[PDB]
Design a protein around this ligand. Sequence first.
Ligand SMILES: NC(=O)c1ccc[n+]([C@@H]2O[C@H](COP(=O)([O-])OP(=O)(O)OC[C@H]3O[C@@H](n4cnc5c(N)ncnc54)[C@H](O)[C@@H]3O)[C@@H](O)[C@H]2O)c1
Ligand SMILES: NC(=O)c1ccc[n+]([C@@H]2O[C@H](COP(=O)([O-])OP(=O)(O)OC[C@H]3O[C@@H](n4cnc5c(N)ncnc54)[C@H](O)[C@@H]3O)[C@@H](O)[C@H]2O)c1
Ligand SMILES: NC(=O)c1ccc[n+]([C@@H]2O[C@H](COP(=O)([O-])OP(=O)(O)OC[C@H]3O[C@@H](n4cnc5c(N)ncnc54)[C@H](O)[C@@H]3O)[C@@H](O)[C@H]2O)c1
Ligand SMILES: NC(=O)c1ccc[n+]([C@@H]2O[C@H](COP(=O)([O-])OP(=O)(O)OC[C@H]3O[C@@H](n4cnc5c(N)ncnc54)[C@H](O)[C@@H]3O)[C@@H](O)[C@H]2O)c1
Ligand SMILES: O=C(O)CCc1cccc(Cl)c1
Ligand SMILES: O=C(O)CCc1cccc(Cl)c1
Ligand SMILES: O=C(O)CCc1cccc(Cl)c1
Ligand SMILES: O=C(O)CCc1cccc(Cl)c1
Lengths: 267, 267, 267, 267
Amino acid sequence: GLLDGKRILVSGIITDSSIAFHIARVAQEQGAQLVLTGFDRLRLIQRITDRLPAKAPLLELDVQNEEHLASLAGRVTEAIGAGNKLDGVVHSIGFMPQTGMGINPFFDAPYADVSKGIHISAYSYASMAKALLPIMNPGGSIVGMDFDPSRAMPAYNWMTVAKSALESVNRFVAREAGKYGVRSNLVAAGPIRTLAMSAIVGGALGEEAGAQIQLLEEGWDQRAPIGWNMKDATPVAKTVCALLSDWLPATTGDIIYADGGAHTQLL
Amino acid sequence: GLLDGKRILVSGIITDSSIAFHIARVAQEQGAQLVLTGFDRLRLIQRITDRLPAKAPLLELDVQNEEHLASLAGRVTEAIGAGNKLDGVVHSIGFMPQTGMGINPFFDAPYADVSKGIHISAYSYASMAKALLPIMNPGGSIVGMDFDPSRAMPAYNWMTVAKSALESVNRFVAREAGKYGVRSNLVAAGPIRTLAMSAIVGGALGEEAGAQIQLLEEGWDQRAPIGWNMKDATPVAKTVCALLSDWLPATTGDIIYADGGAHTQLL
Amino acid sequence: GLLDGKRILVSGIITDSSIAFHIARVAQEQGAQLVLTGFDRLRLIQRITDRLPAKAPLLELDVQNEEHLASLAGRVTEAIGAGNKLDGVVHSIGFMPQTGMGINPFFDAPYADVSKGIHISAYSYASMAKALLPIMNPGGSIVGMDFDPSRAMPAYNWMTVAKSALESVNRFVAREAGKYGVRSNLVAAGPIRTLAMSAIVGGALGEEAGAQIQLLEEGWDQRAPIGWNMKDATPVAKTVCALLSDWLPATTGDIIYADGGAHTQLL
Amino acid sequence: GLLDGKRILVSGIITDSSIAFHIARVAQEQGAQLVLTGFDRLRLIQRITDRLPAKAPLLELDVQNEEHLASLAGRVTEAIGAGNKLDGVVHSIGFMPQTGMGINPFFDAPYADVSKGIHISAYSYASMAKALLPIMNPGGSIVGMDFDPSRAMPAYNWMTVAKSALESVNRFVAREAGKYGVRSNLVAAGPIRTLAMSAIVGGALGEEAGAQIQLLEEGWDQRAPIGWNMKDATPVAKTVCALLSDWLPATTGDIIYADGGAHTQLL
Ligand SMILES: NC(=O)c1ccc[n+]([C@@H]2O[C@H](COP(=O)([O-])OP(=O)(O)OC[C@H]3O[C@@H](n4cnc5c(N)ncnc54)[C@H](O)[C@@H]3O)[C@@H](O)[C@H]2O)c1
Ligand SMILES: NC(=O)c1ccc[n+]([C@@H]2O[C@H](COP(=O)([O-])OP(=O)(O)OC[C@H]3O[C@@H](n4cnc5c(N)ncnc54)[C@H](O)[C@@H]3O)[C@@H](O)[C@H]2O)c1
Ligand SMILES: NC(=O)c1ccc[n+]([C@@H]2O[C@H](COP(=O)([O-])OP(=O)(O)OC[C@H]3O[C@@H](n4cnc5c(N)ncnc54)[C@H](O)[C@@H]3O)[C@@H](O)[C@H]2O)c1
Ligand SMILES: NC(=O)c1ccc[n+]([C@@H]2O[C@H](COP(=O)([O-])OP(=O)(O)OC[C@H]3O[C@@H](n4cnc5c(N)ncnc54)[C@H](O)[C@@H]3O)[C@@H](O)[C@H]2O)c1
Ligand SMILES: O=C(O)CCc1cccc(Cl)c1
Ligand SMILES: O=C(O)CCc1cccc(Cl)c1
Ligand SMILES: O=C(O)CCc1cccc(Cl)c1
Ligand SMILES: O=C(O)CCc1cccc(Cl)c1
């Protein structure tokens, strides 16, 4: 197993189409022992994760709650046993209020909404590293989920700005994590048909926002030299597991693109 | 004159070493008619700007104050006369609380502080564009000040994250501004010895933060193929005026580097 | 005039739709005194440049001819007068044999053909700098023409590789030019309907190569926040003149994008 | 084993400090069956590779020899058996004549020398893909070795330009390889003390070239958040094996940085 004997915390599961659900499944297939964290709807998340190949403890974590963050390391240690530390951490958490996405004009998002989205989607990558690095082993790995924000695009709007901030945060987290012998990297995935993303394509955020996202998805598979299947998160999950493994030991502060190669092609 | 007959709003003057003070001076030397905006210490700013080559109206603008922003376009129109519009806007505004910079550990900045810095330094670029685009002429130009955040560095810490967010915001502002025939760009300057920056090199934010910034300054002049004079903001001011002029008419959503070429060289 | 009193060498005119023809016209409109260089068909080029606003001396320069390059500085000095030096140099030269472009498979271009294209399109930027820097004034400016090669695309094929090499060459030319007080930069233009480019869209290099280039052109105007007019080279010419002027004095080794902002937008 | 059952061709071994020697060793440790290719000194290379964990067939390949390239696929098939195909290809080949590196001025490299270096170091990545893709399995992987050329630096000179060309070639090879279900990527390594590199630091290419490279090496370990050991190629070799494996299945046309994170940090 690629991750045999490793203890890995995975955040971000909310449905069976969550990218983090497939990260967790593949990590368990490869021998990892998991601790899961979930936000708000813990009964739902427990029912969802009962379908993973192995039972895993589930801890509550709202990344805006400083009490959850202050207690997290102790709750993880209780779950994996005293004297044991984590080898890996997966941040698969993102949110932007509806005013910051969709057909709602870019200029009309109030800063309170933008700040909440940047808190959950970017600052919390530093928050989780701060909480968990003291209980991580040398040779460990922190991985977060990214969507390439180097160019503007329709509808993503303020979430694009949040991802730009996240990429910057990751480079600073690498500086801190390096003192522990730990790597920090992001995986920039192509579009994946989660429940939330299917709802937006179906017009949850306005019709032409849905139309624009559908056009973006189609161009992605066209550009990608090996194609891109938005209905299959397994290639993204495998890439996260590659970064959690010992096989990219000299990569940190960096971004790995699991996007079919689409970002390397103009058309 | 490069800017003859143009009406340009310039924010960000607080002392005679402010980058915006030199932008304003060079723009007036080149024939522009200015409206100035200032934050908080308006009596001080009026005294400072009395030393500009020409008298200019000074308007109060705290970019965190929605009432200041809601009234700004009307106050500008009163200052330049009904039926007149702006040809240019300069955003030269930045702030990050001390916890987000210096020797203070990156992980110890509370989100309230980071969010305030991102509000002032990044979101407000969109806020000012929203306020002023309705009173801008086709062919107009919005310019903001940047510090290349593509790599992490010591001490800049959360201000680096704010600049990453600003670069992303600029690409979305270009989308909106294009509907008015207006360009939006950033100037990424090398280090400039403002009053605040001299204080930090002198240890206002901790000793080794000051030591690290001094090392960064020295490496900049070494890397720059044409050298870099941190005591001379005129090359930065001229670059801003180039973007305000009609001579870069097909550049938008972009970043122009006024840094001596340092970012193009590894050592 | 933006370039009043400046002496500027302009290469690359072959027809009245050459980008260099419009660079030369705008530079003369702005007060520059020009020396022109032309390749092979000098009688044709003289007839073309008789239509410029002012008469300019025309010198022969095949950038693959070491004798032309060894004599160039002396021939320029004869044209502008002893004791006078150049303030600006424009490289607007590119060529790739047909096997390296179009529907002809990427793998089927022989290296002899690729090497000729890289010689003319990339190495010659260093060759011209070597020849002309000894007769350039401090504060001078070298500008070359680029087409953004950071992503692969259909049909451009080996010319894309040549532009990647050119961008690298430019960063090294900046190191050398800096010792003379001279800047070196590229302008990355959007697509322009030169005679050669119209012929390729019309199928000179194969039908689906023409089809692919037409699709690339259409997406460019769609992406550009201020639009893109492939029939109008004046915005590109003005950007070159901006870099030749004194108004971007701290930019070197760099690339300025005169592309409507298209490269800053995904769709 | 990470590469259990995979058939992989590895080029570029010349001494026991070659990066390709360590790629080959790690690949064999992980269960791969290798075919090796060597240039010119085949008796030496056979003696060197006798020290690998397993015996591997050695084929002659001068990438400038079209007869070697035309026969390569048939010689590989003879070595692995009819009906068998390759799963992986490693390009670890580079050369630039001495005039294109070191204290020898950048402008003094003749194009004949530069063209030879670009032939061996960049064009040959396309040459090898053309030769070997017809005998590669779907799901296969082509990997080449890179040194980040996005910024100029002392001494690397024309080899930097060759690496810029290689990165561009890789994006086009990905387009071709995708039709076979094959990925193409580069690994950008930090500096490694090969025999050639130790000789240059010792002044083989001039004293201040050696001095400049030693300064570059020292800054690399300082910048890298996890450090950088130029005497240990194993982290680079493991990264190549990661790309040869099935664990980065959605990455192509891309560059993975095995450099300690140094390129993500300014200082
Ligand atoms: N789906 C795509 O197309 C795509 C592409 C690239 C990257 N990503 C990124 O992948 C990450 C996971 O998103 P997803 O697509 O799997 O959608 P998802 O809705 O399944 O996951 C989002 C997760 O964020 C969590 N979350 C929200 N607020 C939180 C809080 N205050 N505290 C803790 N957790 C909170 C949700 O509970 C949920 O588990 C996100 O960073 C997303 O931006 C998604
Ligand atoms: N000095 C450098 O080295 C350097 C280098 C590159 C970029 N920059 C950028 O240039 C910009 C101008 O900074 P400076 O170096 O001239 O320093 P400065 O201190 O002279 O200017 C900062 C300005 O921000 C304004 N400001 C702060 N909070 C505000 C608010 N709530 N509303 C409105 N205005 C507010 C200040 O009043 C002040 O005028 C900043 O964006 C800075 O990041 C500076
Ligand atoms: N047309 C576009 O869409 C576009 C876009 C971006 C950049 N560019 C670049 O602009 C430059 C000028 O090209 P153009 O579009 O105006 O086409 P063009 O055909 O009008 O100019 C090409 C020039 O290269 C010159 N040339 C070729 N071989 C030469 C040699 N051995 N010695 C000296 N000169 C030689 C030609 O004589 C000709 O004057 C080129 O670098 C081109 O790549 C063009
Ligand atoms: N050593 C470093 O610091 C470093 C860092 C990053 C990347 N790289 C790259 O790694 C690759 C391998 O280089 P290395 O450092 O292991 O040095 P090396 O000298 O051990 O390997 C170079 C290889 O190129 C081969 N070669 C040269 N000409 C050839 C030809 N005509 N045909 C076939 N093969 C030929 C040599 O025989 C030799 O095996 C190169 O692309 C190099 O640029 C090296
Ligand atoms: O980050 C997310 O959750 C969604 C990422 C995304 C995919 C496809 C289109 C867009 Cl606009 C955005
Ligand atoms: O944006 C600012 O006001 C300061 C920019 C800066 C210059 C030199 C060093 C650092 Cl760390 C930061
Ligand atoms: O460099 C040149 O002369 C042509 C640049 C170009 C424009 C539009 C499409 C393509 Cl593929 C290439
Ligand atoms: O590609 C190669 O073989 C050498 C790469 C390299 C390492 C360290 C310093 C320099 Cl200048 C170059």
